[model samples]
Target: KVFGRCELAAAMKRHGLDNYRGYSLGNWVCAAKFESNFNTQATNRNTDGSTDYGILQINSRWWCNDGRTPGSRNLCNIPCSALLSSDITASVNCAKKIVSDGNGMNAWVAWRNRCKGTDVQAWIRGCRL
Candidate 1:
């Protein structure tokens, strides 16, 4: 499912992502904005033979099992397919694990380059969440 900007922001907030791991809700909103443009079914394959999955694009290298990434840690202990659903519980939960691992939102290069060190409030602006 593709979400409206405010819809995604509200969903994340409902999942307790606001101020999660020292990153504000807007930061996450911005990350998702650039990561997958709020599309739940998005996927991107890296040159390393690893693939990123879902809205936040959790990676198969360390976060999920895609049955193709050799020696995957699958730290999130979830099938990569789980990320590509309208139900975002798995995606949000896995993202929390990524942040709690001390990588924070920087685990996503898009977030690091686009959302980080920017005025993220605009990402959630006008959202009545």
Candidate 2:
């Protein structure tokens, strides 16, 4: 399931991510747009042989297990497949857990390389709740 800008923001907000761990909703909005194009089912096989799962692109290395990458911290205790659903509750919870761990959205490299230090407000342009 692919989400539009507003729906994604609303969903994240519903999961208590509006200002989670000091991460603004705009931060997540931008990263989600670039990381997975807002597709819930999106997955990428990284060069390290690990995979990024779901809309937030949570990694098998730490957050989840997708069988392809073994020995994850799996801190969320959720299978990667669970994140692929249209209902984003599980994905949001796990992502919240990640940011809660430390380094905030720095856990997502794309945010560090792209979304951070930019005009994050633009990410939610015209989609204001």
Candidate 3:
């Protein structure tokens, strides 16, 4: 089942995503809201034939291996399935690596298109964290 926004925000805060890799909690939470709606098993077939995986919607082209995508780079060096889990350490760690590699949250199209330069408080509003 997909986590609700409050639940996801709480978990993210507990996982130290409130401030990691110099990214704001809002950036982390808001991008997730737009990308996967906090669903751990979220996946999408991109028009380019790559797939986006997990809460962050990591691209199969650069981040992980789905075993179906061709020319897999998997720069994150992880199975795409690994990101689709309740224990999110691997996913979070991989995300940190991605953010540090370049452009911060700009790497995720959801962040660029939706969360960037917008007020993100709603993504975390009413969360107990």
Candidate 4:
């Protein structure tokens, strides 16, 4: 089943993202949609025989070792279970750490820039919740 929108919103908020203004939800949904159609269990094999896993399409062996135990990988080894458990907060935060140079969303100014072009302030002016 597709993840709930409220769950997604909560995830966005936990990441310090403005769900409406930043298009944070939209952007995440876009990425997830484009990448894996929101399939939390999705996996792909690389030419070297390693695997990428989960909804965000995280590369398991590169960032985690599933057989070693939970939360083992050192490089932002966000547990695959968290990503698949509908716990978006953990997933998004982990992603922010992994992709944002340890600076979190502040390091993702590029995403904010993209939203700025969407006239977010004007959009939020009339937006209700």
Q: Evaluated with TM-score, which candidate comes out highest?
A: 1
RMSD of 4: 6.2
| Residue pairs of candidate 2 with colliding backbone atoms | none
Model 1: which residue pairs collide? none
Cα deviation of 68, candidate 4, in Å: 8.5
List, residue by residue over 1-129, the lDDT tens digit for candidate 3.
667646666766777766676677766666666787767777888887888877777778877888878887877777788788788866777766776777666776766877787887776677565
The positional error of residue 91 in candidate 2, measured at the CA in angstroms, is 1.4
TM-score per candidate, chains pooled? 0.90, 0.86, 0.85, 0.54
Q: Write the per-residue lDDT of candidate 2 for residues 35-83, one digit (tens) a residue.
A: 8887777788788777777777767887776776777776777767877
The lDDT of model 1 is 0.74
lDDT of each: 0.74, 0.73, 0.74, 0.50
TM-score of 4: 0.54
Model 4 steric clash pairs: none
Task: Indicate whether candidate 2 or candidate 3 has the larger lDDT.
Answer: 3
Stretches of model 3 off by over 4 angstroms after superposition: none
lDDT string for model 4 (1-129, tens) is 466434333445546755433335444433454455556666765454445566666555556555543343546554555556544546655565454444433332333454334543442243234
- Collision count of model 1: 0
Model 3, residue 58: distance off in Å is 1.4
Quality of model 3 by C-alpha lDDT: 0.74
Ranking by TM-score: 1, 2, 3, 4
**Pick by lDDT: 1 or 4, better one:** 1
